[PDB]
Amino acid sequence: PFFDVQKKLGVDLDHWMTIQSAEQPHRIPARCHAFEKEWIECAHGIGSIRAEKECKIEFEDFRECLLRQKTMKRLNAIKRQRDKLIKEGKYTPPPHHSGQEDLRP
Amino acid sequence: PGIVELPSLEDLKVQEVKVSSSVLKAAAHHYGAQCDKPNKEFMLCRWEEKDPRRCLEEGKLVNQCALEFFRQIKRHCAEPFTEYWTCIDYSGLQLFRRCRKEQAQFDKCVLDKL
Amino acid sequence: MSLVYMNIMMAFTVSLTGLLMYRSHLMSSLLCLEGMMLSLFILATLMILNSHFTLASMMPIILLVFAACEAALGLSLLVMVSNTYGTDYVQNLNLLQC
Amino acid sequence: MFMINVLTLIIPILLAVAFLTLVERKVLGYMQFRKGPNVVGPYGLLQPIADAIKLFIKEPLRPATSSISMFILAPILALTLALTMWIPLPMPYPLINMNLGVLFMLAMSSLAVYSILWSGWASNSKYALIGALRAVAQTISYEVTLAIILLSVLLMNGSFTLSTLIITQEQVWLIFPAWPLAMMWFISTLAETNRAPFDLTEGESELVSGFNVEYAAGPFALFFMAEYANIIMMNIFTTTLFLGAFHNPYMPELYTINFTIKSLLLSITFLWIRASYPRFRYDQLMHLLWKNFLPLTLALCMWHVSLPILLSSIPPQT
Amino acid sequence: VAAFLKNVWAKEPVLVASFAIAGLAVILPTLSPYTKYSLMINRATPYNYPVPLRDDGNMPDVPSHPQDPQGPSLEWLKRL
Amino acid sequence: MNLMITLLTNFTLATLLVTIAFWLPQLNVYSEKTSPYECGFDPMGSARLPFSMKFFLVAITFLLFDLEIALLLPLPWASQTTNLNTMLTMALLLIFLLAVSLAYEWTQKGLEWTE
Amino acid sequence: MNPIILIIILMTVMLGTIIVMISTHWLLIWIGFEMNMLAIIPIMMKKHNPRATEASTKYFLTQSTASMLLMMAIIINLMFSGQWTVMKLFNPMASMLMTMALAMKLGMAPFHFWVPEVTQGIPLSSGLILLTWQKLAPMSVLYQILPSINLDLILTLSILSITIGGWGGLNQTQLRKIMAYSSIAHMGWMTAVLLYNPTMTLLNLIIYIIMTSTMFTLFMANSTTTTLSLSHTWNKAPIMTILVLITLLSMGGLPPLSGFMPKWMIIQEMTKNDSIILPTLMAITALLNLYFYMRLTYSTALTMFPSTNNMKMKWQFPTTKRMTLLPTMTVLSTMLLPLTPILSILE
Amino acid sequence: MWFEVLPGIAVMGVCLFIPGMATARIHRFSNGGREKRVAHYSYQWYLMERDRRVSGVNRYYVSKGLENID
Amino acid sequence: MMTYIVFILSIIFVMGFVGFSSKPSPIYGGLGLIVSGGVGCGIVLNFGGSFLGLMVFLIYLGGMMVVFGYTTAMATEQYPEVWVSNKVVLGTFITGLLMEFLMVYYVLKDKEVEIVFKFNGMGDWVIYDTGDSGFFSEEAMGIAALYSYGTWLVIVTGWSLLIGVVVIMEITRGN
């Protein structure tokens, strides 16, 4: 019993909130507005089964925009290898990562 | 997936408009009125293609135009502009309403000269 | 995800095990309930502020409003319980066993 | 050089607390047909020094039946809450410029009650528990009306920032378009600071000494300077809200001296209120802020919501 | 209804004043003509960036310069 | 960063005065000095007995009215909107509902204390 | 109770139910759940006895904890989805927490303990409102999220609640505890079929609501709350004994009465997908339910228990009760079996 | 007479004069002879760090005029 | 270490939660929930939403003081187990603290833990944004837009609160 009254009557009660890419006060965009737009437009009117089969790439890319698992995973790999290289003694950091390089602007 | 693309450091080098924020805030209206065309071209392109890697030459052009406008300002009315941006820069919140006298002086000198 | 999420859900699980194992005091379980709602508030506003969902900033205020409404309901029921028996012990609510 | 700024904020406020105890004792002498302390020094200028040295060489006296942890923790919380109360106050530049300073005062006003409550609870006394529950009832009486008065006043300011309150009344005083709100604000801060006629916590007649009836010297002095710092900053808060002065960004000392004179006159009026009226009951106060202040405040909040829409006088939020 | 008003003003004037103030605040934005000016002032406050539209060729209403005559001006905000 | 420095400075100012108020003077502590004070006579029972409270309904509605005014504080920012009529109507309706709740408690003798 | 306040509270309960039923947002679903619970608390405290306080406290704690689990599942879905729409959940953890929250709200075993106690401690009308109205919003939300529920969890809950309700209904002499255990068994029956065909769940919901409403109206009209009090009805009104006889016969799934139609269509739907052991087990535990129904109908209809002397004084007065829609609801609860293909309107 | 409290009142006056003047002087010293910048919103913060970057001293109150450019 | 500021605030958050979820005495439970609310306000203030932190701090302080009045009236006994006065309370407090410090040591060594989700080891400064917000604060503007967008939310919240007042007044009636 999803007695959908809102589309029958033509009023909206919670439709403006339900997604991240809706209308915002003076058009403040979210962090992953474009990815939500792509995933929403990929999976409109095709049903949930075809949504999980035919929009897996867009949905998983949007989910990586949301939580950022793989980004911090790669950063962890880089950080760990740099620390091991520093401790072992095969690497020296460049001067622009040390604190001064006459910054650009 | 794909290797992400990035322009080389020689493509990003440019002469910089090296002034404080009070210099920008004092001459904000003259800069907006005089240099509207490259600024608006850059803004239209930057809002259209949503990519800073494809919007570099227009940033270069807007930097040259802003620097040309400031170099024109320096040639004629350096001293009223100096006093005006000093009176702007003393204020903590950089109020416009505390320097209407320097506003009138700078406006008169710029209007009569250029 | 981030480790602040780890600590927030770990606090939620602590207060959940606190609510589900009684210590012969109903008001302490009410406090654990408010702790769980506080944890829900913190988790929600952390993700909402991180992902810049600006229209959803009105939500946790509403969630905390309903939290306090149900807390007031719990306190009123506790006044009735303490007005029937001597104290607020949860072992006195055993009439419905026969 | 921030620590120097913090020290030069926190030392003069407690010096002024001691001299406010002096001035209060002198005024409370002089209104009641007598004199104040004028024997210890030249016109009694050394009385707060003698009181302060005396209170720190007396016995500490932690009770046996009292939970020692909360007993020691409560005066520390009281003094720290009174000391961090003063931070975002613009005189004319605050120590810490804050986007939302008013809500910070409200939250710290909520927190400072807990020192009174825990000092009453920890000291195993019936009079202390009576004073603690009277403090609870006083807080649930005043807090709603205080917050909604400050909300309906700040609607003409545009933001919760206290420094904007200087700019928003540089033409005319804010006591003119919100004079009823000014009077109920003054009464609400009279009730907040536990001062007469709304004492009801440190009652020397209904009780003996209230929540600190077991606190001997030293720890008791912490509550004393906490309360006096509270009354000074609350008068300062009222002065900033309704009696803003002329501010010159080149000479801030003009605003400082104008503001200081106005806040001193407000504290003189505060002690004037102290020595004029009998103390209320602690249920008559509850029937005062709810049956008399709250409906008028709801009406005034309707009025101050509709009025900027009415006159196209919506203040900037920047 | 005048006798009741006299009695309630004789007994609890605070409630009478509150009811009058609340009624005033309810019924005044309906009849006042200055509210539309407040609406336009709120609308004409530039929080965002006014991004320009691509000139296809048929758009004579939108200006090409901030000092062009066509476009929404703010003279009424100066006069009021 | 400056706020934590200020809070720590206030805290170690407060805890310095207490710590010098406990170890400095001469102490004479007996099993009569620390007894509870009951106006000179021995107390008749403990101080941890149930101290019954008559204003419970006012405390519950204090929670509800505190949350009502918590909902009401975004008003200075909400006055900076474009849909001004709807914002004005919802603000007025919320405040009117608050006043309706207060009036219903007033007419039903809820604010009057028990016993 | 003031009837104006009672009317306002009842309309607020209904408003919370439709706010759950018509919203497209998880937060609005949660708001409807909260307002429904907080508005139905004082209906259970109408008579102001200690048993009502106990029932209200236990119900409040159970629904509060279930709402917390509901909110946690909603927040985890927000995290892993970035949206709020009422559809399938994008996390198995959120699906499991939402399923346990709705099971705790439905009184499903092993979260079934509060239901007989809460049903016993409150009046008959409040128990009817509980067991019929409150068991629609969780069923609606379960209807919304059927792509995401784990089959093993929901089938475990269904067969566990069916077995536990059928076993627990054998040891009760109070009518409200009997009705609560019967309710537990029926929710097991409905949710065993939800992942296969939810139209079967809607049909079972409607028939169970009609049947238990008819029986609660009969118990209210006779003003009996224990079986020994029910046994006096043959000396008071024999037609009411006939009515409770046919409704108890229908409630056990005995054909050709309308209560057998839901179980028949459940068995019909669950064997299209090659599940044969499960409907047989549900049929045998339905036989246990029919057993304690048979015990009740032996007590009230097919025998004449001894009566008292004041029953003559009760004979001299005709009833003036407001038996609203009792004959229509009895007819619908008994003879709706030749109109079985009417169920297609719920598709 | 009644003017003998005025010693203590004047002492309170100077004790409340001290902190505001101290904050004004400290703000005017540690910011290069000018008022302290007020960064209420992130645009002002970005501008302040822009000055901190163009200054080249890692001190934003050292303000570079138009004589820096060519 | 200072980059882990939200980590330290969340560890104080969990410490207060396990302090008051042992249920020693509702006075000390009130102290623990006050601590947890204050440090949660701190956490969400470093994430940027100062208004939300101030509201949750103020609301929880008011509720905690009222419930303190309640337990001084209702939930109190002769010798309250404040802490260490009971075996099971001290045992479960030590158990929770030990478990929390154990998983903190685990995540500060492997830089990745798997309890049912997967949590990373660095600070939460990485997941911030490099852009500016212009001339507005996002959280304040969202709760401002509550009035202009969420009329339905306002209606249901106000109605729920009004009938909540009615509910609590018709519960404590006695007959």
Ligand SMILES: CCCCCCCCCCCCCCCCCC(=O)OC[C@H](COP(=O)([O-])OCC[N+](C)(C)C)OC(=O)CCCCCCCCCCCCCCCCC
């Ligand atoms: C800081 C700046 C100055 C602040 C001003 C105050 C300074 C002086 C202080 C004096 C001493 C106060 C000591 C404490 C006193 C505490 C008691 C107290 O005040 O109780 C409040 C008293 C309470 O009165 P009460 O206690 O007698 O109540 C009687 C109650 N019954 C009848 C039930 C028994 O007054 C109020 O509540 C009034 C609040 C202020 C109202 C302001 C109204 C403004 C005008 C509105 C419009 C009027 C025109 C008509 C309508 C027109 C419409 C267009």
Ligand SMILES: CCCCCCCCCCCCCCCCCC(=O)OC[C@H](COP(=O)(O)OCCN)OC(=O)CCCCCCCCCCCCCCCCC
């Ligand atoms: C056992 C009993 C308890 C013993 C310990 C007691 C400790 C002291 C208790 C009193 C102090 C409690 C403070 C609670 C949080 C207060 C937050 C606050 O004051 O925020 C104000 C301000 C808001 O900033 P905003 O308006 O957004 O403007 C900045 C934009 N440029 O914010 C700022 O300007 C930001 C400054 C940095 C903020 C860092 C994050 C907060 C740090 C919290 C530390 C832990 C506090 C623990 C409190 C426990 C209370 C019981």
Ligand SMILES: CCCCCCCCCCCCCCCCCC(=O)OC[C@H](COP(=O)(O)OCCN)OC(=O)CCCCCCCCCCCCCCCCC
């Ligand atoms: C439409 C306007 C906006 C309405 C919504 C906003 C309202 C804002 C104000 C909210 C007030 C909340 C509290 C109201 C309580 C009313 C009931 C009540 O308590 O009445 C009691 C009082 C008599 O006092 P008593 O019986 O002694 O009380 C017990 C101890 N005091 O009884 C009385 O004094 C009589 C109370 C009823 C009559 C009041 C008449 C006021 C008329 C003012 C002028 C006309 C204004 C135009 C609108 C019409 C208003 C009816």
